[PDB]
């Protein structure tokens, strides 16, 4: 997901502005749905929500807009159990042998023959939660096992929390209402208000451990790869209690990152650290936020946002609809140079021409250069020490950058990666002169619709994740509900689309209408005032009761 909130110091009108570009699946239980909810006098909110939920999850009201992105915080911890050396169904805590508990569930299964059989399955549980086996990594042997304690299992506050956000007046009120209830499960919140405040919060439900406990309570090898893993044989590694927290064992709101500014805040699923580089967010629990290199979407956004020029609605819209493959900025200049250095080397000819002709974009009309660039980048990522300038903590915005072609082991490896990528691309059944839009589509009944955008891992702000199905890449998730909100005097002005359309049912009039619009990148008014609603020539109305 991306989010940018702009405030009075940087917007063209001196008021707030919010770009919400969440990235989520195009099917299933997290498929967004647009709606506007009004109890006249005390609620009026519009946005998009998830299946089954009678609250708005991302949206706007008369003076506020807010949105979310998945955070990098931990929302569970794994516990490594020391098993009783006499019995691998018991585990030790402070040297004392405890029995696992067993909970059986019974499932009915429909057979080949159409009849139902019953399958009983035993779930083993420790004081932390259920045990989990990941073969070759988290085993259950005679020495050790892993249990998993999820902090959102006790979060009974999540729906009240979004209903509360739906009733918020401005940024200050939003912050009070989120910090009071701590009901948000696993996303950042970013918002802007009419007064021109821009707010970022990493305010969610995060297992709390006091900082002095972390070094001995961590499992050093597992934390190395970012798994929140704790020592489950020591009772002092239990989540810490603090009576300021809304739920026993979670981090108090005062210890979670928040940034309130009048210029901008942004997040593209990196940690809180560089939400706005003029004010780094530092010093948090490693369960909360760490200073890691930022991915290419955030680098792209920060490259467009930094500086002193005003930001117009149009500028934020175009950061999405440009489909620029920002990862190309880091490697393609050096790559084309390798190409020039190897002319008439015939394995590389088609690849190098596609790359030089490429507009560096994931547009419907973008050339096959994008497909060569992707398969090359998949390989470049698995190479060691190939960056001309590697990640530099002191220049987190401009590094890594460039290919180390001045190191012969790299030039040989990079050339080989490009030959292997080019072979893969040529072995697939891509026509001559085919564009990105001829390949990446969303199926709608017996037809297909071309979809612009590409994987967020290549720095495309308009992130679109696809999978091979027959002769095409089929879109499965990415840009979903789009809302871009400003606050002119008459009432909030919101523009966007729901990329996959309102209805997942092929019979609906609203199965693909916004998808056709998304293909052509033509955003629309999101009508909110009764004046906007009444101006709509497709307006329909039904009143119902029972």
């Amino acid at each position: 997901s991306n989010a940018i909130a702009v405030g009075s110091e940087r917007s063209a009108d001196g008021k707030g502005m919010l770009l919400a570009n969440p990235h989520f699946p195009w099917n299933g239980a997290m498929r967004f749905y647009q709606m506007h909810l009004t109890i006249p006098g005390r609620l009026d909110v519009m946005g998009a929500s998830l299946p089954g939920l009678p609250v708005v999850n991302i949206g706007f009201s008369r003076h506020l807009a807010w949105t979310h992105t998945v955070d990098t915080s931990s929302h569970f911890t794994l516990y490594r159990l020391a098993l009783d050396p006499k019995d691998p169904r018991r585990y030790l805590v402070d040297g004392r042998s405890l029995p696992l508990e067993e909970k059986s569930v019974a499932i009915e299964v429909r057979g080949a023959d159409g009849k139902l059989s019953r399958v009983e399955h035993k779930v083993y549980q420790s004081i932390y939660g259920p045990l989990v086996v990941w073969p070759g990594k988290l085993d259950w042997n005679r020495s050790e096992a892993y249990a998993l304690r999820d902090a959102n299992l006790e979060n009974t506050r999540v729906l009240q929390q979004w209903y509360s956000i739906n009733q918020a007046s401005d940024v200050a009120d939003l912050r009070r209402r989120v910090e009071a209830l701590q009901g948000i499960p696993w996303v950042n919140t970013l918002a802007a208000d009419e007064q021109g405040n821009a707010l970022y919060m990493n305010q969610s439900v995060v297992p709390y451990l006091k900082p002095e406990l972390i070094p001995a309570c961590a499992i050093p090898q597992l934390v190395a790869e970012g798994l929140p893993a704790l020592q489950g044989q020591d009772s002092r590694c239990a989540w810490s209690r603090d009576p300021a927290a809304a739920q026993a064992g979670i981090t108090p709101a005062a210890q979670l990152p928040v940034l309130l500014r009048r210029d901008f805040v942004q997040n593209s699923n990196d940690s809180a650290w560089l939400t706005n580089p003029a004010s780094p967010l530092q010093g948090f629990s490693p369960l909360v936020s760490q200073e890691k290199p930022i991915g290419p979407r955030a680098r792209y956004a920060l490259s467009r946002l930094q500086g002193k020029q005003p930001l117009e609605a149009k500028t934020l819209e175009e950061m999405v609809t440009a489909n620029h493959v920002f990862s190309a900025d880091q490697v393609l200049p050096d790559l084309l140079r390798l190409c020039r250095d190897n002319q008439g080397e015939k394995s590389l000819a088609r690849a190098c021409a596609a790359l030089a002709q490429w507009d560096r974009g994931a547009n419907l009309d973008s050339g096959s250069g994008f497909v060569y660039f992707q398969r090359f980048m998949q390989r470049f990522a698995e190479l060691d020490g190939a960056w001309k300038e590697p990640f530099d903590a002191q220049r987190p915005l401009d590094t890594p950058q460039g290919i180390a072609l001045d190191r012969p082991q790299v030039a040989t490896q990079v050339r080989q990666a490009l030959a292997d990528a080019a072979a893969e691309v040529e072995k697939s059944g891509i026509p001559d002169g085919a564009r990105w839009g001829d390949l990446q589509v969303s199926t709608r009944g017996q037809e297909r619709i071309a979809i612009p955008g590409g994987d967020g891992h290549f720095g495309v702000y308009n992130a679109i994740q696809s999978v091979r199905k027959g002769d095409h890449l089929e879109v499965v998730g990415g840009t979903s509900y789009i809302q871009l909100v400003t606050f002119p005097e008459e009432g909030p002005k919101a523009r966007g689309l729901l990329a996959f359309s309102q209805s997942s049912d092929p019979r609906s009039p609203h199965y693909r209408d916004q998808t056709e619009l998304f293909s052509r990148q033509q955003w629309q008014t999101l009508p909110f005032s009764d004046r906007q609603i009444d101006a709509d020539p497709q307006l329909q109305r039904l009143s119902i009761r029972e």
Binding site: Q34, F76, I107, Q502, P506, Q514, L526, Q538
Partner: protein, 164 residues
């Protein structure tokens, strides 16, 4: 009863629900969402009830791409009657009302549907829903940040046998 809503749709089938209270508000949401997505919701509630293998057999997957029988074991474990009852008992009166209105508006669409916008008309899993079903969906989304990412691993967890 005491459920009422006024629903306006603008271009692209975006509903605008007006009601005097949370029950009527939920009634309009549930009815408008069902018109567009009754089949999707029924499917996801089947998953969250752990009844995939019962309607579809062990050979298929949920929309999260888990096998039906491990997915069912996970959601039967997650959404046990005592967990749902404690979650319900912790809801505010307003949220309770939102949810009761939603189930009743969804069921009202289903009572009347003739297939105009509902491709799964007549399937045995397209059924009236209850507030507990919407708590099952809620819990399923809560744990997608956590134990839900380890659903297969939970199902696989079995103690060692005699091996070396």
């Amino acid at each position: 009863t005491g459920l009422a809503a006024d629903i306006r749709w603008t271009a692209y089938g975006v509903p605008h629900i007006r009601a005097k209270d949370e029950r009527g508000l939920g009634y309009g949401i549930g009815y408008a969402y069902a018109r567009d997505n009754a089949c999707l919701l029924a499917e996801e509630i089947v998953t969250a009830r752990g009844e995939r293998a019962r309607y579809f057999g062990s050979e298929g997957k949920s929309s999260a791409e888990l096998d039906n029988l491990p997915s069912d074991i996970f959601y039967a474990w997650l959404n046990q009657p005592e967990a749902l009852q404690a979650f319900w008992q912790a809801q505010t009166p307003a949220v309770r009302q939102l949810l009761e209105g939603y189930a009743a508006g969804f069921n009202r669409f289903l009572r009347e549907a003739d297939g105009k916008t509902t491709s799964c008309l007549g399937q045995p899993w397209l059924r009236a829903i209850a507030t507990d079903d919407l708590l099952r969906l809620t819990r399923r989304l809560l744990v997608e940040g956590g134990v839900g990412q380890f659903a297969d691993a939970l199902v696989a967890a079995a103690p060692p046998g005699a091996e070396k």
